[PDB]
């Protein structure tokens, strides 16, 4: 009935993590 | 560490999508 918050929180954290990994790998 | 199989699959989908969005700005 109520949606879980683990899927939404992990998904947003994955996008944020990609910023740090790509930025660090792109100099 | 070793997160559940569902967590790793969702992480790749979020990073892969974010990769395309950033690539559009870096193109």
Curated annotation (Swiss-Prot), chains A, B:
The chain crosses the membrane at residues 7-27. It comes from the Eukaryota. There is a cross-link at residue 25 (Glycyl lysine isopeptide (Lys-Gly) (interchain with G-Cter in ubiquitin)). Expressed in a wide variety of tissues. Isoform Psi is found in glial tumors. Isoform Alpha is expressed in spleen, breast, ovary, testis, colon and brain, and at low levels in skin and lung. Isoform Sigma is expressed in spleen, breast, ovary, testis, lung, colon, brain and at low levels in skin. Changing residue 19 to V: Constitutive mitochondrial location. Enhanced fiber formation with humanin. Ubiquitinated in the absence of XRCC6/Ku70. Ubiquitination promotes protein degradation. Coiled coil: none annotated. Homodimer. Forms higher oligomers under stress conditions. Forms heterooligomers with BAK. Interacts with BCL2L11. Interaction with BCL2L11 promotes BAX oligomerization and association with mitochondrial membranes, with subsequent release of cytochrome c. Forms heterodimers with BCL2, BCL2L1 isoform Bcl-X(L), BCL2L2, MCL1 and A1. Interacts with SH3GLB1. Interacts with humanin; forms fibers with humanin which results in BAX conformational changes and sequestering of BAX into the fibers, preventing BAX activation. Interacts with SFN and YWHAZ; the interaction occurs in the cytoplasm. (Microbial infection) Interacts with adenovirus E1B 19K protein; this interaction blocks BAX oligomerization. Intact BH3 motif is required by BIK, BID, BAK, BAD and BAX for their pro-apoptotic activity and for their interaction with anti-apoptotic members of the Bcl-2 family. Plays a role in the mitochondrial apoptotic process. Under normal conditions, BAX is largely cytosolic via constant retrotranslocation from mitochondria to the cytosol mediated by BCL2L1/Bcl-xL, which avoids accumulation of toxic BAX levels at the mitochondrial outer membrane (MOM). Under stress conditions, undergoes a conformation change that causes translocation to the mitochondrion membrane, leading to the release of cytochrome c that then triggers apoptosis. Promotes activation of CASP3, and thereby apoptosis. Belongs to the Bcl-2 family. This is Apoptosis regulator BAX. It comes from Homo sapiens (Human). The chain holds residues 166 to 192 of 192 of the full protein.
């Amino acid at each position: 009935g109520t949606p879980t918050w683990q899927t939404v929180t992990i998904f947003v954290a994955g996008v944020l993590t990609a910023s740090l990994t790509i930025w660090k790998k792109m100099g």
